Short mmCIF file of C-alpha atoms in Angstrom, two decimals:
data_model
loop_
_atom_site.label_atom_id
_atom_site.label_comp_id
_atom_site.label_asym_id
_atom_site.label_seq_id
_atom_site.Cartn_x
_atom_site.Cartn_y
_atom_site.Cartn_z
CA UNK N 1 34.49 -62.56 -1.98
CA UNK N 2 32.17 -61.39 1.47
CA UNK N 3 35.23 -58.83 2.18
CA UNK N 4 34.35 -57.76 -1.31
CA UNK N 5 30.61 -57.73 -0.96
CA UNK N 6 30.57 -56.04 2.57
CA UNK N 7 32.88 -52.71 1.64
CA UNK N 8 31.24 -52.57 -1.84
CA UNK N 9 27.25 -52.60 0.46
CA UNK N 10 28.52 -50.50 3.05
CA UNK N 11 29.50 -47.96 0.15
CA UNK N 12 26.90 -47.66 -1.57
CA UNK N 13 24.20 -47.84 1.53
CA UNK N 14 26.58 -45.56 2.93
CA UNK N 15 26.23 -43.79 -0.31
CA UNK N 16 22.79 -43.68 -0.75
CA UNK N 17 22.34 -42.40 3.63
CA UNK N 18 24.26 -39.36 2.11
CA UNK N 19 21.62 -38.84 -1.75
CA UNK N 20 18.82 -39.05 1.21
CA UNK N 21 19.69 -36.52 3.15
CA UNK N 22 20.88 -33.69 0.28
CA UNK N 23 17.56 -34.52 -1.41
CA UNK N 24 16.28 -34.37 2.19
CA UNK N 25 18.05 -31.36 1.81
CA UNK N 26 17.03 -29.99 -1.53
CA UNK N 27 13.60 -30.26 -1.07
CA UNK N 28 13.13 -28.50 2.44
CA UNK N 29 14.82 -25.72 0.27
CA UNK N 30 12.25 -26.48 -2.47
CA UNK N 31 9.56 -26.24 -0.48
CA UNK N 32 10.35 -22.93 0.93
CA UNK N 33 11.10 -21.40 -2.71
CA UNK N 34 7.96 -22.46 -3.32
CA UNK N 35 5.71 -21.01 -0.98
CA UNK N 36 7.58 -17.96 -1.33
CA UNK N 37 6.84 -17.80 -4.96
CA UNK N 38 3.05 -19.60 -4.54
CA UNK N 39 1.84 -16.51 -1.79
CA UNK N 40 3.80 -13.95 -4.94
CA UNK N 41 1.57 -15.50 -7.31
CA UNK N 42 -1.56 -15.16 -5.23
CA UNK N 43 -0.37 -11.28 -5.35
CA UNK N 44 -0.15 -11.21 -8.75
CA UNK N 45 -3.50 -12.80 -9.39
CA UNK N 46 -5.31 -10.30 -6.75
CA UNK N 47 -2.54 -7.34 -8.41
CA UNK N 48 -4.18 -8.40 -11.33
CA UNK J 1 -24.72 -9.26 3.33
CA UNK J 2 -22.49 -7.01 1.74
CA UNK J 3 -18.51 -6.74 2.50
CA UNK J 4 -17.25 -4.65 5.18
CA UNK J 5 -13.86 -3.78 5.49
CA UNK J 6 -11.87 -2.13 7.79
CA UNK J 7 -9.11 -0.13 8.40
CA UNK J 8 -7.44 -0.67 12.05
CA UNK J 9 -4.79 2.21 10.76
CA UNK J 10 -2.90 3.54 14.15
CA UNK J 11 -3.92 6.93 14.80
CA UNK J 12 -7.75 7.27 12.97
CA UNK J 13 -9.31 3.80 12.06
CA UNK J 14 -11.74 3.36 8.86
CA UNK J 15 -14.25 1.28 8.64
CA UNK J 16 -17.71 0.80 6.11
CA UNK J 17 -18.69 -0.93 3.58
CA UNK J 18 -16.87 -2.66 0.76
CA UNK J 19 -18.85 -1.05 -2.37
CA UNK J 20 -19.26 2.11 -0.63
CA UNK J 21 -16.49 5.02 -1.18
CA UNK J 22 -16.27 6.01 1.86
CA UNK J 23 -15.65 4.76 5.18
CA UNK J 24 -18.65 5.25 7.66
CA UNK J 25 -17.33 5.64 10.06
CA UNK J 26 -13.62 7.51 10.78
CA UNK J 27 -13.02 7.63 13.94
CA UNK J 28 -9.33 8.54 16.52
CA UNK J 29 -7.71 4.85 17.33
CA UNK J 30 -3.57 3.00 22.23
CA UNK J 31 -2.96 -0.88 21.71
CA UNK J 32 -1.15 -0.02 18.08
CA UNK J 33 1.69 2.12 19.07
CA UNK J 34 4.36 0.60 17.25
CA UNK J 35 1.96 -0.38 14.55
CA UNK J 36 0.68 -4.09 14.98
CA UNK J 37 -2.01 -5.58 17.99
CA UNK J 38 0.03 -4.62 21.41
CA UNK J 39 -3.25 -4.75 23.29
CA UNK J 40 -5.95 -7.79 22.30
CA UNK J 41 -8.18 -7.11 25.08
CA UNK J 42 -8.50 -3.17 24.22
CA UNK J 43 -8.29 -4.10 20.06
CA UNK J 44 -10.89 -6.57 20.86
CA UNK J 45 -12.52 -4.36 22.79
CA UNK J 46 -13.07 -1.58 20.06
CA UNK J 47 -13.02 -3.58 17.48
CA UNK J 48 -16.61 -5.13 19.52
CA UNK J 49 -17.32 -1.46 20.17
CA UNK J 50 -16.84 -0.95 16.24
CA UNK J 51 -19.32 -3.81 15.01
CA UNK J 52 -21.80 -2.97 18.00
CA UNK J 53 -21.99 1.04 17.72
CA UNK J 54 -20.05 2.16 14.95
CA UNK J 55 -22.15 0.02 11.89
CA UNK J 56 -24.65 -0.61 14.69
CA UNK J 57 -24.23 -5.32 12.80
CA UNK J 58 -23.23 -8.68 13.94
CA UNK J 59 -20.23 -9.68 12.69
CA UNK J 60 -21.78 -13.16 12.09
CA UNK J 61 -24.24 -12.16 9.57
CA UNK J 62 -21.26 -9.65 6.84
CA UNK J 63 -17.83 -11.46 5.39
CA UNK J 64 -14.79 -9.31 7.05
CA UNK J 65 -11.40 -8.02 5.90
CA UNK J 66 -9.06 -6.12 7.61
CA UNK J 67 -5.53 -5.14 6.96
CA UNK J 68 -1.78 -5.20 8.55
CA UNK J 69 0.85 -3.34 8.82
CA UNK J 70 3.29 -4.10 5.82
CA UNK J 71 6.38 -4.18 8.83
CA UNK J 72 4.03 -7.06 11.50
CA UNK J 73 4.30 -9.65 12.48
CA UNK J 74 3.52 -13.06 11.20
CA UNK J 75 2.64 -14.25 14.57
CA UNK J 76 0.29 -10.57 14.85
CA UNK J 77 -1.39 -12.18 12.09
CA UNK J 78 -1.71 -15.19 13.11
CA UNK J 79 -3.32 -14.66 16.41
CA UNK J 80 -5.72 -11.53 14.52
CA UNK J 81 -7.38 -14.39 12.54
CA UNK J 82 -7.98 -16.80 15.52
CA UNK J 83 -9.53 -14.57 17.92
CA UNK J 84 -11.12 -13.28 15.21
CA UNK J 85 -12.35 -16.23 13.91
CA UNK J 86 -13.45 -17.23 17.53
CA UNK J 87 -15.57 -15.06 18.92
CA UNK J 88 -16.90 -13.28 16.28
CA UNK J 89 -17.05 -16.10 13.84
CA UNK J 90 -17.54 -13.75 10.77
CA UNK J 91 -17.80 -16.44 7.78
CA UNK J 92 -15.09 -15.52 5.68
CA UNK J 93 -11.65 -13.28 6.61
CA UNK J 94 -9.23 -11.97 4.26
CA UNK J 95 -5.41 -10.20 5.78
CA UNK J 96 -3.92 -6.83 2.86
CA UNK J 97 -0.98 -5.36 3.67
CA UNK J 98 -2.46 -0.85 4.14
CA UNK J 99 0.36 0.02 1.58
CA UNK J 100 -0.85 -2.24 -0.78
CA UNK J 101 -4.46 -1.22 -0.28
CA UNK J 102 -3.03 2.17 -0.98
CA UNK J 103 -0.54 1.09 -4.14
CA UNK J 104 -4.74 -0.43 -5.25
CA UNK J 105 -6.46 2.52 -4.47
CA UNK J 106 -4.38 4.24 -7.18
CA UNK J 107 -4.37 1.53 -9.92
CA UNK J 108 -1.31 1.23 -9.51
CA UNK J 109 -0.39 -1.91 -9.31
CA UNK J 110 3.92 -1.90 -9.18
CA UNK J 111 4.69 1.46 -7.19
CA UNK J 112 6.02 3.21 -4.17
CA UNK J 113 4.33 4.42 -0.88
CA UNK J 114 4.74 7.18 1.66
CA UNK J 115 2.91 6.66 4.85
CA UNK J 116 2.87 7.69 8.06
CA UNK J 117 1.19 7.32 11.19
CA UNK J 118 1.15 7.13 15.71
CA UNK J 119 5.65 6.98 15.70
CA UNK J 120 6.13 5.37 12.17
CA UNK J 121 6.97 6.87 8.46
CA UNK J 122 7.41 4.05 6.13
CA UNK J 123 8.50 3.94 2.44
CA UNK J 124 7.27 1.03 1.12
CA UNK J 125 8.06 -1.01 -2.72
CA UNK J 126 5.71 -2.66 -3.79
CA UNK J 127 6.20 -4.32 -7.27
CA UNK J 128 2.64 -6.06 -9.55
CA UNK J 129 0.97 -6.20 -5.43
CA UNK J 130 3.46 -7.54 -3.10
CA UNK J 131 5.27 -5.82 -0.35
CA UNK J 132 9.10 -6.20 -0.58
CA UNK J 133 10.29 -6.72 3.64
CA UNK J 134 14.03 -6.33 2.71
CA UNK J 135 13.54 -3.12 1.13
CA UNK J 136 11.19 -1.35 3.31
CA UNK J 137 12.31 2.10 5.32
CA UNK J 138 11.25 2.73 8.29
CA UNK J 139 12.00 5.71 9.90
CA UNK J 140 10.90 7.32 12.52
CA UNK J 141 10.27 10.98 11.89
CA UNK J 142 6.71 10.62 11.68
CA UNK J 143 3.62 13.43 12.30
CA UNK J 144 3.94 12.25 16.13
CA UNK J 145 7.43 14.39 15.54
CA UNK J 146 5.85 17.07 14.16
CA UNK J 147 3.30 17.43 16.17
CA UNK J 148 5.45 17.12 18.82
CA UNK J 149 7.39 20.15 17.83
CA UNK J 150 4.19 22.33 17.40
CA UNK J 151 3.98 20.78 20.62
CA UNK J 152 6.71 22.26 22.10
CA UNK J 153 6.75 25.88 20.30
CA UNK J 154 3.28 26.22 21.82
CA UNK J 155 4.28 25.81 25.50
CA UNK J 156 7.00 27.71 24.51
CA UNK J 157 4.66 30.62 23.99
CA UNK J 158 3.10 29.80 27.31
CA UNK J 159 -0.92 28.56 26.02
CA UNK J 160 -2.35 26.79 27.87
CA UNK J 161 -2.85 23.57 25.14
CA UNK J 162 -8.84 13.91 31.99
CA UNK J 163 -7.95 12.04 28.81
CA UNK J 164 -10.14 13.45 26.89
CA UNK J 165 -8.10 17.39 27.97
CA UNK J 166 -5.08 15.40 26.23
CA UNK J 167 -6.77 13.98 23.20
CA UNK J 168 -8.26 17.81 22.68
CA UNK J 169 -4.35 18.95 22.93
CA UNK J 170 -3.39 16.25 20.22
CA UNK J 171 -6.24 17.76 18.13
CA UNK J 172 -5.54 20.58 18.40
CA UNK J 173 -1.46 20.35 17.72
CA UNK J 174 -2.98 18.51 14.33
CA UNK J 175 -5.78 20.89 13.28
CA UNK J 176 -3.07 23.70 13.43
CA UNK J 177 -1.13 21.43 11.15
CA UNK J 178 -3.62 21.56 8.76
CA UNK J 179 -4.49 25.31 8.74
CA UNK J 180 -0.69 26.70 9.27
CA UNK J 181 2.31 24.46 8.60
CA UNK J 182 3.73 24.29 5.17
CA UNK J 183 6.81 23.05 4.05
CA UNK J 184 11.03 36.17 9.15
CA UNK J 185 12.01 33.81 5.85
CA UNK J 186 8.36 32.95 5.97
CA UNK J 187 6.88 36.71 5.04
CA UNK J 188 3.69 37.28 7.50
CA UNK J 189 1.28 34.93 8.72
CA UNK J 190 -1.48 33.20 9.16
CA UNK J 191 -3.81 34.79 12.99
CA UNK J 192 -5.03 31.37 13.06
CA UNK J 193 -7.00 31.31 16.56
CA UNK J 194 -8.18 28.55 19.01
CA UNK J 195 -11.67 27.80 20.29
CA UNK J 196 -10.99 30.20 22.84
CA UNK J 197 -10.23 32.85 21.09
CA UNK J 198 -6.41 32.91 21.27
CA UNK J 199 -3.59 33.48 18.88
CA UNK J 200 -0.73 34.64 17.16
CA UNK J 201 0.66 35.78 13.57
CA UNK J 202 2.39 31.69 13.29
CA UNK J 203 5.54 33.24 11.25
CA UNK J 204 8.70 31.24 10.93
CA UNK J 205 7.24 28.72 12.86
CA UNK J 206 5.29 26.95 9.66
CA UNK J 207 8.49 26.75 7.73
CA UNK J 208 10.47 25.26 10.27
CA UNK J 209 8.31 22.64 12.14
CA UNK J 210 8.00 20.72 8.53
CA UNK J 211 11.19 21.32 8.18
CA UNK J 212 12.21 18.01 10.58
CA UNK J 213 10.74 15.64 8.93
CA UNK J 214 13.58 16.48 6.53
CA UNK J 215 16.02 17.76 8.56
CA UNK J 216 15.35 17.63 12.36
CA UNK J 217 17.14 10.44 11.84
CA UNK J 218 16.94 9.63 8.49
CA UNK J 219 14.37 12.43 6.55
CA UNK J 220 11.95 11.22 3.99
CA UNK J 221 13.77 12.08 1.17
CA UNK J 222 16.49 9.62 2.08
CA UNK J 223 13.63 6.48 3.34
CA UNK J 224 12.37 6.62 0.25
CA UNK J 225 15.64 5.96 -1.35
CA UNK J 226 17.55 3.95 -0.02
CA UNK J 227 14.40 1.81 0.33
CA UNK J 228 14.42 1.40 -3.43
CA UNK J 229 18.63 1.50 -3.46
CA UNK J 230 17.40 -2.04 -1.15
CA UNK J 231 15.41 -2.99 -3.84
CA UNK J 232 15.80 -5.01 -6.70
CA UNK J 233 18.30 -3.38 -9.27
CA UNK J 234 16.57 -3.28 -12.14
CA UNK J 235 12.05 -2.16 -11.23
CA UNK J 236 13.78 0.86 -9.85
CA UNK J 237 12.72 3.31 -12.96
CA UNK J 238 9.50 1.48 -12.01
CA UNK J 239 9.10 2.85 -9.11
CA UNK J 240 9.43 5.94 -9.12
CA UNK J 241 8.01 6.32 -11.91
CA UNK J 242 4.90 5.18 -9.67
CA UNK J 243 5.49 6.90 -6.19
CA UNK J 244 2.21 7.38 -3.79
CA UNK J 245 1.66 8.75 -1.17
CA UNK J 246 -1.05 8.20 1.89
CA UNK J 247 -2.11 9.38 5.12
CA UNK J 248 -3.74 11.71 7.19
CA UNK J 249 -0.34 12.99 8.51
CA UNK J 250 1.22 13.38 5.14
CA UNK J 251 -1.48 16.35 5.12
CA UNK J 252 0.24 19.68 5.16
CA UNK J 253 1.00 22.77 2.40
CA UNK J 254 3.77 21.86 -0.82
CA UNK J 255 4.37 18.63 1.51
CA UNK J 256 4.41 16.86 -2.77
CA UNK J 257 6.14 20.25 -4.51
CA UNK J 258 8.86 19.57 -1.78
CA UNK J 259 8.89 15.62 -1.92
CA UNK J 260 8.69 16.00 -5.70
CA UNK J 261 11.99 18.49 -5.52
CA UNK J 262 13.70 17.11 -3.15
CA UNK J 263 13.52 13.10 -5.46
CA UNK J 264 14.68 14.68 -8.77
CA UNK J 265 17.06 16.30 -7.78
CA UNK J 266 18.04 13.38 -5.65
CA UNK J 267 17.52 11.24 -8.44
CA UNK J 268 19.10 10.95 -11.72
CA UNK J 269 18.11 13.54 -13.90
CA UNK J 270 16.91 11.34 -17.02
CA UNK J 271 14.97 9.20 -14.86
CA UNK J 272 10.98 9.61 -14.68
CA UNK J 273 10.33 9.93 -11.60
CA UNK J 274 6.86 10.93 -11.12
CA UNK J 275 4.47 12.01 -7.57
CA UNK J 276 0.16 11.15 -7.40
CA UNK J 277 -1.22 14.26 -6.66
CA UNK J 278 -3.55 12.52 -4.44
CA UNK J 279 -3.18 15.66 -2.05
CA UNK J 280 -6.49 16.11 -0.65
CA UNK J 281 -7.20 14.81 2.65
CA UNK J 282 -10.39 12.93 1.60
CA UNK J 283 -7.49 11.23 -0.59
CA UNK J 284 -5.08 10.85 1.94
CA UNK J 285 -7.45 9.37 4.62
CA UNK J 286 -9.86 7.05 2.58
CA UNK J 287 -6.75 6.01 0.10
CA UNK J 288 -6.27 2.72 2.50
CA UNK J 289 -10.00 1.81 2.68
CA UNK J 290 -10.09 2.29 -0.72
CA UNK J 291 -8.29 -0.12 -1.71
CA UNK J 292 -9.38 -2.63 0.96
CA UNK J 293 -13.09 -1.68 -0.43
CA UNK J 294 -11.66 -2.00 -3.71
CA UNK J 295 -10.21 -5.93 -2.64
CA UNK J 296 -13.22 -6.93 -1.02
CA UNK J 297 -16.10 -5.62 -4.00
CA UNK J 298 -14.33 -7.91 -6.83
CA UNK J 299 -16.24 -11.14 -8.14
CA UNK J 300 -13.20 -12.20 -7.44
CA UNK J 301 -12.96 -12.14 -3.81
CA UNK J 302 -14.91 -14.31 -3.32
CA UNK J 303 -12.09 -16.81 -3.62
CA UNK J 304 -9.31 -15.14 -2.10
CA UNK J 305 -10.58 -14.46 1.01
CA UNK J 306 -10.30 -16.94 3.87
CA UNK J 307 -13.81 -18.90 4.35
CA UNK J 308 -15.24 -19.92 7.94
CA UNK J 309 -14.62 -23.63 6.76
CA UNK J 310 -10.93 -22.89 5.94
CA UNK J 311 -10.32 -22.26 9.96
CA UNK J 312 -12.07 -25.33 10.53
CA UNK J 313 -9.93 -27.43 8.63
CA UNK J 314 -6.87 -25.52 9.85
CA UNK J 315 -5.94 -22.81 12.58
CA UNK J 316 -3.61 -20.10 12.42
CA UNK J 317 -1.52 -21.44 9.38
CA UNK J 318 -4.20 -20.17 6.76
CA UNK J 319 -3.43 -16.50 6.79
CA UNK J 320 0.16 -17.17 5.68
CA UNK J 321 -1.43 -19.32 2.42
CA UNK J 322 -4.42 -17.41 1.98
CA UNK J 323 -2.72 -13.77 2.99
CA UNK J 324 -0.44 -12.75 0.60
CA UNK S 1 -25.08 9.64 -25.70
CA UNK S 2 -28.21 7.78 -23.64
CA UNK S 3 -26.72 4.68 -23.13
CA UNK S 4 -24.01 6.11 -21.64
CA UNK S 5 -25.50 7.66 -19.03
CA UNK S 6 -28.34 4.47 -17.92
CA UNK S 7 -25.00 2.94 -17.97
CA UNK S 8 -23.35 4.68 -15.84
CA UNK S 9 -26.30 4.96 -13.71
CA UNK S 10 -26.34 1.70 -11.21
CA UNK S 11 -21.89 2.44 -10.77
CA UNK S 12 -21.87 1.16 -7.80
CA UNK S 13 -20.38 4.13 -5.36
CA UNK S 14 -16.03 2.53 -6.36
CA UNK S 15 -16.77 2.59 -9.12
CA UNK S 16 -18.62 6.12 -9.35
CA UNK S 17 -15.42 6.90 -7.04
CA UNK S 18 -13.17 5.82 -9.70
CA UNK S 19 -14.72 7.39 -12.47
CA UNK S 20 -13.40 10.82 -10.73
CA UNK S 21 -9.79 9.51 -10.36
CA UNK S 22 -9.29 8.23 -13.80
CA UNK S 23 -10.64 11.51 -14.77
CA UNK S 24 -8.08 13.42 -12.81
CA UNK S 25 -5.35 11.25 -12.29
CA UNK S 26 -5.40 9.56 -15.68
CA UNK S 27 -2.31 7.00 -17.00
CA UNK S 28 -0.05 5.83 -19.51
CA UNK S 29 1.32 2.12 -19.51
CA UNK S 30 3.97 3.12 -22.04
CA UNK S 31 7.21 5.36 -20.90
CA UNK S 32 9.08 4.55 -24.16
CA UNK S 33 11.66 2.69 -23.44
CA UNK S 34 9.25 -0.48 -23.98
CA UNK S 35 12.13 -1.40 -26.30
CA UNK S 36 14.45 -2.26 -23.11
CA UNK S 37 12.49 -5.03 -22.37
CA UNK S 38 13.02 -6.43 -26.04
CA UNK S 39 15.76 -6.31 -25.44
CA UNK B 1 6.32 35.03 -14.04
CA UNK B 2 8.92 31.87 -16.13
CA UNK B 3 8.38 29.39 -13.26
CA UNK B 4 4.94 30.40 -12.84
CA UNK B 5 4.41 29.97 -16.89
CA UNK B 6 6.24 26.53 -16.91
CA UNK B 7 4.30 25.62 -14.63
CA UNK B 8 1.04 25.78 -15.18
CA UNK B 9 2.11 25.77 -19.40
CA UNK B 10 3.31 22.84 -18.72
CA UNK B 11 -0.73 21.58 -16.90
CA UNK B 12 -2.16 22.77 -20.01
CA UNK B 13 0.13 20.85 -21.93
CA UNK B 14 -1.15 17.57 -19.84
CA UNK B 15 -4.77 18.28 -19.88
CA UNK B 16 -4.70 19.83 -23.62
CA UNK B 17 -3.27 17.26 -25.18
CA UNK B 18 -5.40 14.67 -23.29
CA UNK B 19 -8.39 15.84 -25.78
CA UNK B 20 -6.94 14.55 -28.80
CA UNK B 21 -6.93 11.68 -30.15
CA UNK B 22 -3.65 10.02 -30.62
CA UNK B 23 -3.90 11.16 -33.96
CA UNK B 24 -4.80 14.92 -35.40
CA UNK B 25 -1.42 15.52 -33.00
CA UNK B 26 1.76 16.91 -34.74
CA UNK B 27 4.74 15.26 -33.10
CA UNK B 28 1.89 11.80 -33.98
CA UNK B 29 4.37 9.36 -31.98
CA UNK B 30 5.03 5.79 -32.80
CA UNK B 31 3.13 2.66 -32.54
CA UNK B 32 0.37 3.44 -30.66
CA UNK B 33 -1.72 0.46 -31.81
CA UNK B 34 -3.37 0.12 -28.01
CA UNK B 35 -2.97 -4.11 -27.34
CA UNK B 36 -5.20 -6.09 -26.70
CA UNK B 37 -6.47 -5.80 -22.56
CA UNK B 38 -6.28 -10.03 -22.20
CA UNK B 39 -9.21 -9.70 -19.45
CA UNK B 40 -9.82 -12.45 -17.07
CA UNK B 41 -10.04 -15.84 -18.59
CA UNK B 42 -9.90 -17.90 -15.56
CA UNK B 43 -6.64 -19.39 -14.53
CA UNK B 44 -5.40 -20.47 -17.82
CA UNK B 45 -2.98 -22.66 -19.67
CA UNK B 46 -0.36 -20.54 -21.96
CA UNK B 47 1.96 -22.85 -24.64
CA UNK B 48 5.01 -21.04 -25.55
CA UNK B 49 7.17 -21.62 -28.65
CA UNK B 50 9.99 -19.00 -28.86
CA UNK B 51 13.40 -19.43 -31.14
CA UNK B 52 16.38 -19.11 -28.56
CA UNK B 53 19.28 -21.15 -33.23
CA UNK B 54 17.41 -23.69 -31.88
CA UNK B 55 13.71 -23.66 -30.82
CA UNK B 56 11.77 -24.25 -26.68
CA UNK B 57 8.14 -24.63 -25.30
CA UNK B 58 7.42 -23.47 -21.93
CA UNK B 59 4.06 -24.47 -20.35
CA UNK B 60 2.94 -22.25 -17.81
CA UNK B 61 -0.14 -22.91 -15.79
CA UNK B 62 -1.67 -20.04 -13.87
CA UNK B 63 -1.96 -21.12 -10.19
CA UNK B 64 -1.59 -24.42 -8.87
CA UNK B 65 -5.04 -26.17 -8.65
CA UNK B 66 -4.98 -26.47 -12.49
#
């Protein structure tokens, strides 16, 4: 049972870490895209 | 406290107040060879000359707007804000692209801008006031190239065409352009006289010299046609129906007419291509400064500028954040 | 007529220029193909 | 002079037709109706419900502050 718990816990923890990394990368990509769109909207507001 | 608007253009600097129509001072610009600030000491010195001599006012009182080239790098903008705020202690700042100011001056936010200056002629598509960096096309067939064709032809004429003498040389080759150049195949021509009285029958050269920017490198028509090719697929009809030109270096006779012919025969015949004829020298030279002036005048510029408070709170990062 | 006059006065420089420009060059929002916006 | 004629005749077209009032013109063009120019309402929140068989709502915020 301890081996089972440790395998399952290692699986869950490593997959949560992988999730952390993927969410982090998606957050940086989203931040770059949002900054681009924010500058575009400022340009739109001034042109408007 | 009337807002001050400056253009730091490559070949002549235009300065004035936001609410005033014309740049009250327009003098030759150098620290801007490639298009942005090459020499920070020289650029700072010329700016100081501007506020003190040209406009006879301190920078600590009026709010200030500056305009930078479309293709200028970001470090240039960051250092520009650092220098301006630290040294001149203005109350509020802003930065704008010259092409965007040209499109604003024409009251047409969505546009394509053809402009040229020292060493460069560029085509920029602007959609809803945002310059598409990926779509810009930059060519070396600037007014400098044509004026150097003029200078070479004059030296071949063997006319006697310290720095002030070179400035005079450049001016005369420019002055000759406005009067003579038009875009045996040209028939008899003008008698344009030099200040000392020298002259000649400036014949086919007036036709062959302007031909360089179309056919000496990418000519202007190709520059624009590929510029729109690199832009978005479906906004392209908007650009053609909104093509605009600006800059004193564009002031040649029938130049805009030849552009219209070139684009009409190059564009699909079905397209709504049209050129906005701000062809007068005054119009082209004031176009960018005009856009800056309008931008500064409005009641929203009070919220768009980079207030001194902003730069106190944060450093150079504000330029990328507050200026498109 | 008088109202347009006294309103045309106090028209700061930029707007007098804009008056002349929009007088000569005009515009047209419609291009006869706005239906494409629907589709 | 037919080329010169085409030129200044199209210029005359622009000048004269700009004098008429969107009526009085024999070629009565369709559906002008000059809609509103909006003109400011500062920052705004737009509520937009559209048919897509199905109905969807999009809420647009003008700026990041709001």
